[PDB]
Design a protein around this nucleic acid. Structure first.
Lengths: 118, 178, 177, 42, 140, 354, 245
RNA sequence: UUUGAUGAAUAACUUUUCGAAUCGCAUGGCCUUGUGCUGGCGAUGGUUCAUUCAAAUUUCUGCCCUAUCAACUUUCGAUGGUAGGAUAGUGGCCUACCAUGGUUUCAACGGGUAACGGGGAAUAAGGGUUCGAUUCCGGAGAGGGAGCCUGAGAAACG
RNA sequence: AUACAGUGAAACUGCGAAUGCUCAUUAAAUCAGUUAUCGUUUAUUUGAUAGUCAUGGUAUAACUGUGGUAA
């Protein structure tokens, strides 16, 4: 049950000090330094799950890899972000090009767009 | 180039006969780059207290190099400037370009020359084609706008008047100084 | 901790009294900053209220003045040569208030010769400055008195010595030499 | 004085704090005494 | 000798310019107490440097004004005055004499010997055991 | 991790990333607003002194603002703990091989003691100290102060047993060889004195020497050798002497670096190379083949060194510095790295293939 | 303890409210404000105890932020705003004003006040000083800091200020022979002409005052407020003239 | 000679602090009808100073029995000076450098005090013989020594 | 209402959370009184108070999903 943390060169579980703005450690009370045990950065013969990321495609279309594709659930908030997404300019408003998300409620068909930040 | 390390880093190595100086031929070679960056830092306006201290630091740093070096700096100032129409003619300038941009450049120039005289009062040099032509050049079109423009251009009239005042003041001070 | 109470000194009668309370927060004494000379590293302390008090532990550059004609520039320090409190302090060169330092002469002589036109040593009446002053101009190493608490201000301000001050300090050095 | 004057008196907290120590000489002291005599003084 | 201590004993924030020449070497600052007291000419011409001097040092005298009788004068720059005053004992309804042996910093501008009605005023705390400073002298 | 020199591979595994002319505080703040092995190997203002345990398992080092001591644990590569101090500790020693018992000379003319239970009490030394060494065969804490005072207080009693008066105005170092339990006193009047316990008397006085400036020295460093035979010393002009004890003449001389004072000399054991470590405050430490006086290597930390130490086994040089991360060096040609640091071999393999 | 205090018993209430002793267990603590707490009157006491306009705390809160009570021109939204001595509380819905002034028994007293007399309020001028940009500011007893006052204003003065704009109009310098209002000390409530002053630097400046039974009496200068000359007050004082029978 | 009037910024230095990229409502006026300009009445913040709530030290005034307690302090500076660090701030609070002091039979000092003590502190006893009711006790602790952290205010001990 | 405006959980952020019981006894100590702070600090209260880009970049939490471990 212990995780992998980048930086500590040992293939052994270590009791380190873990802090606020770092990985693997989500403290309850704000800002302190607690002592916690994490499994060191060198992968050894005792690990259980390893996380790897596809970078360059090879030969095989794999279903849960290549065939599946989630859409991004959320969308932009800022008008300049909308500009950067769509290739807009300073002059045209984005009230018409804000993303339109459609919802149903029984048979009523309502829809929403976010409040434009800035 | 960094701003938060600008002044301190200048005093770290750019101060002469101390720690980490620059060799003769090399420093001769890297004159233009120092000149360009210091011209940029001068062209930064002193609209805040930090920018005030930065401009004060810039002008305090400048006069410690050497006479041809600061002459080259003043030469780059004149090169941003010009005197060609006025001094190919006697006193006439054919291209009637006395725009607000031109006079703004002139006022920046008279600001920096006021700065360098005030820092190197009894020591700074006077190159002929470097100071004399742009000074009376700027004063000439200052009075040209003062004469040929009515009060409808309060913007032009105000900063032409201040341009005239500063040019005359620095002319008087350079006379007192050299 | 390090306190500045009176709750430990002997009474004026000359007897030891009773312990009163655990030592508080406001009656605190912080840790003394032996400010050395070097790459300027400043450290902030949050003191009572929202007050910020700076402790620079090292420095090269201080702000120095002549009231001889009223000029003041930021210069690079050189060394510690006297201080009335402790010989060890003078030795290890941990600058304090009222310290006697050797300071550079270069920007000051640059201003002097750019402001007068007369070479130092080697406005006439004002140009007849003091002889030991121009001798130290020739030496390139001036005597200054840091007259500011560094471990409170986080700054280092000094003034170059003048006649009777320089006289007594020179006498101090020549008696200690 | 404050601490300048050498108050020769026993200290309780450092009485047996490092008392005692076994004599870990790697010498027999005899030739080293002859040798210290036969040092650079001779 | 006036400057016989380790540092240059001078009155701070006081500038003398050696350029323009003068009559007395250092223009010596001194302010007035007010409060009915008069500044002394011995302090005005006084060449001593006492930052605890009520006239020439940078100390303020605002508050209680008392007086006392000196017994011992064997310190530097400070003395102890002993004041035997009447004390009332109501369970006997009898009076008694009780003396406070209270100290006070003195200025060298005033020379005080045993047998002195000295008028003092309190200040901000001067040292560990003193908060008074002499202003007025009446020796006998 | 950086490798710079050509004859020999240095490895700045720790510490600064930019050498010189970049302040760590502003660079750190700017980089955070825009690898390492020990968790929090820092003191955020500067560091002063380092000594590693003979157990080879703790590393204890002092730090300057909020003057404190960090004890690091190799079994966990982090702070075992942190402990504030009353004043900026000057120099320390570790009584037992463990991290527990420690005792040190402290800038306010005093000393402090430390245990796993925290702290044991302080005593004001009469005059301003310079160095403290503990004779181990019988418990003798002895301190060289300025002047002519070698106070020798035993721990059978706790009393200040006896001062060794000296013919000197200034003492600046003391040391001892563990076999030859002689008190060696290096005093900045160009003089070294040799004393012996159970005699409490001078064994020798010597080391009057000369430089090109012909100025009086400041005898900075004294150190022993594991032979119990040869001692070395180091002078303020940056000049080191290796003396066989049987000769008054210098067996080996070392005009090294620049005229800044040599500040730590520590020999090192390799079966091939019995060598010497000479470091000064001109941001250089030098690695000399002792037998011929051949400078094998040199490490350039690019910030001021406050102390140097090596791991007893092989491989790393811990340097205490003026900069923020006090750092260390793995020399492969020196040898491997010990029991808590075993894969830097591999990572220097990728940086060598780099 | 760890800081200031927030609860306070009925018995510890200051006298010049004239309360009972067992309406509750804790008294309304004054808010911190433009008057000192040891001499101020909170509006809940004023509108619950004295004038009986309201009778429960929630009710008086309800009126206060029905926004009817105006204090010193402005409106308040405090349940415990510290109204103080010689002050102004009006009310629009009754079309009335009340100048608050001390009595001879050391207790507060309302004075029914018409509109134009309520238009102004006096202030004991504490001190004037040169602030930034070299301008002068004058500070009264009640936190009133006014730029550009009279140069003839000295310390220990009395200035009448119109309240519709918060601006100084009139001034009286304390001299000998003035209509004092005694505020503190032993002898609060006895109003007559002063006799004179004894000066005590490092100490006090005592004032001898002869009241209308031709009786003199000595009070601290800090307890002095200035009204005017004899036979002309700037305030419509009530019946009694500071006389206790 | 009086009656009355006036006073009695420079040089730089620095992690920039700043001089609002924030909520409730005016709808007009003018022509350039752009939806252009312009604007008024209500909230949240920020610069400093005052004032308020507090807090820190501090002047002096007051409390038992006992000399079967005559010594006490420099053995953490005891007393004082000078200088510096430290503190929000003075001050031996702390360190150097020094001087060698202070308290005392007017009994210092010391001892015991049942010091659950006393304070008109507290409302009183609207007539109990002295008695009620309230308030301050004073400090420390929150497994135990040691060290650190924020906030205006903590040496917080959940 | 084709930007939202009602309402609103999770969270950012502002402020409070410095007004709990048990154990130990000091005679200028404490406490009461009275000062001083031309010698200090102050969140809050109220009062004044600063001519020196038709709008710049970020990020998260939550959510989605995939997992680990007896926890």
């Amino acid at each position: 049950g212990f995780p992998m943390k980048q930086g500590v060169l040992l293939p052994t579980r270590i009791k380190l000090l873990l802090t606020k703005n770092v990985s693997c450690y989500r403290p309850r009370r704000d800002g302190e330094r607690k002592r916690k045990s994490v499994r060191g950065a060198i992968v050894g013969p005792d690990l259980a799950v390893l996380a790897l990321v596809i970078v360059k495609k090879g030969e095989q279309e794999l279903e849960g890899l290549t065939d599946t594709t989630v859409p991004k659930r959320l969308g932009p908030k800022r008008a300049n972000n909308i500009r950067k997404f769509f290739g807009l300019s300073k002059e045209d408003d984005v009230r018409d090009f804000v993303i339109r998300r459609e919802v149903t409620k029984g048979e009523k068909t309502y829809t929403k767009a976010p409040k434009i930040q800035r | 180039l960094d701003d938060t390390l600008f002044k301190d880093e200048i005093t770290t190595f750019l101060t002469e006969n101390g720690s980490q100086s620059i060799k003769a031929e090399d420093e001769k070679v890297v004159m233009p780059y120092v000149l360009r960056i210091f011209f940029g830092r001068a062209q930064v306006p002193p609209t805040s207290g930090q920018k005030r201290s930065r401009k004060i630091a810039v002008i305090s740093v400048l006069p410690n190099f050497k006479k041809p070096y600061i002459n080259d700096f003043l030469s780059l100032a004149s090169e941003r400037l010009d005197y060609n129409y006025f001094f190919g003619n006697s006193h006439q300038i054919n291209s009637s370009k006395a725009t607000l941009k031109t006079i703004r450049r002139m006022t920046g120039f008279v600001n920096i020359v006021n700065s360098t005289l005030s820092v190197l009062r009894t020591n700074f040099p006077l190159h002929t084609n470097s100071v004399l032509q742009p000074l009376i050049y700027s004063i000439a079109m200052a009075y040209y706008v003062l004469d040929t423009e009515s009060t409808e251009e309060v913007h032009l009239r105000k900063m032409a008047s201040n341009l005239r005042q500063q040019g005359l003041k620095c002319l008087s001070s350079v006379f007192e100084f050299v | 901790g390090i306190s500045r109470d009176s709750r430990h000194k002997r009474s004026a009668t000359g007897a030891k009294r009773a312990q009163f309370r655990k030592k508080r927060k406001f009656e605190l004494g912080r840790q003394p900053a032996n400010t050395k000379i070097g790459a300027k590293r400043i450290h902030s302390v949050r003191t009572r209220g929202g007050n910020k008090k700076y402790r620079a532990l090292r420095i090269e550059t201080g702000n120095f003045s002549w009231a001889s004609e009223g000029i003041s520039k930021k210069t690079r320090i050189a060394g510690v040569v006297y201080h009335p409190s402790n010989n060890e302090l003078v030795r290890t060169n941990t600058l304090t208030k009222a310290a006697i330092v050797q300071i550079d002469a270069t920007p000051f002589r640059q201003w002097f010769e750019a402001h007068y036109g007369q070479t130092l040593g080697k406005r006439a009446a004002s140009a007849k400055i003091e002889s030991s002053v121009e001798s130290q101009f020739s030496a390139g190493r001036l005597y200054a008195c840091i007259s500011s608490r560094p471990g409170q201000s986080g700054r280092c301000d000094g003034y170059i010595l003048e006649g009777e001050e320089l006289a007594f300090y020179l006498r101090r050095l020549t008696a200690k030499k | 004085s404050k601490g300048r004057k050498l108050n020769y008196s026993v200290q309780d907290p450092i009485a047996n704090y490092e008392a005692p120590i076994t004599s870990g000489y790697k010498w027999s002291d005899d030739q080293i005494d002859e040798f210290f005599a036969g040092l650079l003084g001779q | 000798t006036v400057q016989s201590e380790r540092a240059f004993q001078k009155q701070p924030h006081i500038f003398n310019n050696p350029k323009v020449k003068t009559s007395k070497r250092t223009k010596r600052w001194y302010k007035n107490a007010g409060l009915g007291f008069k500044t002394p000419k011995t302090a005005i011409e006084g060449s001593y440097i006492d930052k605890k001097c009520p006239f020439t040092g940078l100390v303020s005298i605002r508050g209680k004004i008392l007086t006392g009788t000196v017994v011992s004068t064997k310190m530097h720059r400070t003395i102890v005055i002993r004041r035997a005053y009447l004390h009332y004992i109501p369970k006997y309804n009898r009076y008694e004499k009780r003396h406070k042996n209270v100290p006070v910093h003195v200025s060298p501008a005033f020379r005080v010997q045993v047998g002195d009605i000295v008028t003092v005023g309190q200040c901000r705390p001067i040292s560990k055991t003193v908060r008074f400073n002499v202003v007025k002298v009446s020796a006998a | 991790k950086s490798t710079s020199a050509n004859d020999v591979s240095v490895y700045q595994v720790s510490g600064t990333n930019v050498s010189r002319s970049l302040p760590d505080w502003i660079a750190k703040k700017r980089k955070r607003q825009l690898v390492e092995l020990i968790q929090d190997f820092e003191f955020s203002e500067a560091s002063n002194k380092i000594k590693v345990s003979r157990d080879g398992q703790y590393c204890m080092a002092t730090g300057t603002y909020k003057p404190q001591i960090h004890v690091y644990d190799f079994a966990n590569l982090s702070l075992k703990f942190d402990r504030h101090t009353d004043a900026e500790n000057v120099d320390f020693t570790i009584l037992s091989d463990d991290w527990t018992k420690s005792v040190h000379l402290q800038n306010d003319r005093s000393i402090q003691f430390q245990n796993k239970g925290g702290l044991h009490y302080t005593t004001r030394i009469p005059k301003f100290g310079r160095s403290l060494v503990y004779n181990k065969v019988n418990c003798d804490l002895y301190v060289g102060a300025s002047g002519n005072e070698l106070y020798r207080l035993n721990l059978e009693k706790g009393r200040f047993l006896n001062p060794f008066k000296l013919d000197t105005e200034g003492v600046n170092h003391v040391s001892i060889n563990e076999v030859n339990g002689l008190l060696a006193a290096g005093t900045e009047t160009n003089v070294v004195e040799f004393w012996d316990p159970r005699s409490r008397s001078r064994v020798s006085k010597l080391y009057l020497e000369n430089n090109i400036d012909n100025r009086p020295f400041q005898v900075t460093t004294t150190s022993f050798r594991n032979d119990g035979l040869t001692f070395a010393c180091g002078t303020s002009n940056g000049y080191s002497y290796i003396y066989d004890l049987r000769t008054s003449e210098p067996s080996i001389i070392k005009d090294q670096g620049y005229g800044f004072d040599i500040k730590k000399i520590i020999w090192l054991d390799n079966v091939g190379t019995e060598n010497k470590i000479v470091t000064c405050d001109k941001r250089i430490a030098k690695i000399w083949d002792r037998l011929d006086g051949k400078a094998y290597a040199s490490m350039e930390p690019s910030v001021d060194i406050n102390d140097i130490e090596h791991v007893p086994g092989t491989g790393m040089f811990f340097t205490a510095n003026e900069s923020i991360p006090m750092h260390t060096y793995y020399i492969p040609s020196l040898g491997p790295s010990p029991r808590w640091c075993s894969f830097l071999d591999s990572i220097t393999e990728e940086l060598e293939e780099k | 303890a760890r800081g200031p205090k927030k609860h306070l018993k009925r018995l510890a209430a200051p006298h010049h409210w004239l309360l009972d002793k067992l309406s509750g267990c804790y008294a309304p603590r004054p808010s911190a404000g433009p008057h000192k707490l040891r001499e101020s009157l909170p509006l809940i006491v004023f509108l619950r105890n004295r004038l009986k306009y309201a009778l429960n705390g929630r009710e008086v809160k309800a009126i206060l932020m029905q926004r009817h009570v105006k204090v010193d021109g402005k409106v308040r939204t405090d349940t415990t705003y510290p109204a103080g001595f010689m002050d102004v509380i009006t009310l629009d819905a009754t079309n009335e004003n009340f100048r608050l002034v001390y009595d001879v028994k050391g207790r507060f007293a309302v004075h029914r006040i018409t509109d134009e007399e309520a238009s102004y309020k006096l202030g004991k001028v504490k001190k004037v000083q040169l602030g930034k940009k070299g301008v002068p500011y004058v500070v009264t007893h009640d936190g009133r800091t006014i730029r550009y006052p009279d140069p003839n204003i000295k310390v220990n003065d009395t200035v009448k200020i119109d309240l519709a704009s918060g601006k100084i109009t009139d001034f009286i310098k304390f001299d000998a022979g003035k209509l004092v209002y005694v505020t503190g000390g032993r002898n609060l409530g006895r109003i007559g002409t002063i006799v004179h002053k004894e000066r005590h630097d490092g100490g006090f400046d005592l004032v001898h005052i002869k009241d209308s039974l031709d009786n003199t009496f000595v009070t601290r200068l800090n307890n002095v407020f200035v009204i005017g000359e004899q036979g002309k007050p700037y305030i419509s004082l009530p019946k009694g003239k500071g006389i206790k029978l």
